[PDB]
């Protein structure tokens, strides 16, 4: 059923587009200045804040880049937003940029300070997918969460308590948790945890176990290809009418869109452009914990590890100066594409028979199997 699912999500994409365009028209930005992932970000956050303000806005004058610090009527923003979505709320839409931010953060940063202070092993990176993602996120917002993500929550919810309505949360938070697991025991053991009203160290210690079980017997976690507002704004402006032509977040749609995107980014004096593009690209598909081998395979070019990556973050801090600042064009194109999955595999070869698709192969017709016998460069982005 390609009617609701493909076209209803198109309608949520149209909203973000339309809105971004309107909002650019207010700031009186240029074309080059609307394609600046920097400005796009600021706008996206202005909105999520207002639906739950001001921000950094970079301008282009003869030669150099000027940063403007601006503020907007928190309600005006909310007004312009609905205008774009037909006066609807389109929580999906806000939630979408809620993820784009997530997926960018799960790749720009490593959240160790928090894992340990919770009592999780820092080496449990690959399980913290969406730890940044506000609880306000929707139902299809939590499905993107890693097993480890859930644990850090319950453990804190439990840790402060064990140190009214709060109960329905805990059980559900576990049901979700449990719905991540895809094996008998895994599934059953989650229940044995959900049994205690005041679950103390008994649970505290047990879930941590299950956290580690997922390192081997992974769960089902959905991945959503969520592109920056500018990319959708630009697309909408170019005529693409997604609600009518359909769109996906786990199909070929997102890759294809990024095959023509003209996104620019601010880049510090000593940073490597190629390295910058890599980052953004990995946030566009939630590939921050993917096997570097495969990421590079599909990417088309080396996908260098975080340590060897030359960049500190895409957003520009108030500390820095503009004099020594310039901007590059982000390389977001990829070689092939792949069905962003949810499954963690089980039996060691996973996704037996599943392959990669050419960017011409619109339909999922002919699959391609990668052979990794090769001089690779690692598997752990972190």
């Amino acid at each position: 059923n390609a009617t609701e699912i493909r076209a209803s999500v198109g309608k949520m994409i149209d909203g973000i587009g339309r809105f971004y365009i309107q909002m650019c028209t207010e700031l009186k930005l240029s074309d080059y200045e609307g394609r600046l992932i920097q400005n796009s970000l600021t706008i996206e956050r202005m909105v999520l804040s207002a639906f739950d303000t001001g921000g950094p806005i970079y301008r282009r004058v003869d030669g150099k880049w000027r940063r403007e610090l601006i503020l907007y009527d928190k309600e005006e923003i909310r007004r312009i937003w609905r205008q774009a979505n037909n006066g609807d709320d389109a929580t999906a839409g806000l939630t979408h940029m809620m993820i784009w931010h997530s997926n960018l953060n799960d790749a720009t940063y490593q959240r160790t300070r928090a894992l340990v202070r919770t009592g999780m092993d820092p080496r449990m990176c690959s399980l913290m997918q969406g730890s940044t993602l506000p609880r306000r996120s929707g139902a299809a917002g939590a499905a993107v969460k890693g097993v480890g993500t859930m644990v850090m929550e319950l453990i804190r919810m439990i840790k402060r308590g064990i140190n009214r309505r709060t109960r329905i949360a805990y059980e559900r938070m576990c049901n979700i948790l449990k719905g991540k697991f895809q094996t008998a025991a895994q599934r059953t053991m989650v229940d044995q945890v959900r049994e205690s009203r005041n679950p103390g160290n008994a649970e505290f210690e047990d879930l941590i176990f299950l956290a580690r079980s997922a390192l081997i017997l992974r769960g089902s976690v959905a991945h959503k290809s969520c592109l920056p507002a500018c990319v959708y704004g630009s697309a909408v402006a170019s005529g693409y009418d997604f609600e009518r032509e359909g769109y996906s977040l786990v199909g070929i749609d997102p890759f294809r869109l990024l095959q023509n995107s003209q996104v620019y980014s601010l880049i510090r004096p000593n940073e490597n452009p190629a390295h910058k593009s890599q980052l953004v690209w990995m946030a566009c598909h939630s590939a921050a914990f993917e096997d570097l081998r495969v990421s590079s395979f599909i990417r088309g070019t080396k996908v260098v590890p975080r340590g060897k990556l030359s960049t500190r973050g895409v957003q520009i801090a108030s500390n820095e100066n503009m004099e020594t600042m310039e901007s590059s064009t982000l390389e977001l194109r990829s070689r092939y594409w792949a069905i962003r999955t949810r499954s963690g595999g089980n039996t060691d070869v996973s996704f037996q028979g599943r392959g990669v698709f050419e960017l011409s192969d619109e339909k999922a017709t002919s699959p391609i199997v990668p052979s990794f016998d090769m001089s690779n460069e690692g598997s752990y982005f972190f």
Partner: peptide
């Protein structure tokens, strides 16, 4: 250490999953 130990899979392909 302080590094990764397993790979979270993002795509559907024939891939030995590292841990």
């Amino acid at each position: 250490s302080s590094g990764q130990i397993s790979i979270q899979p993002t795509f559907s392909v024939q891939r030995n999953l590292p841990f």
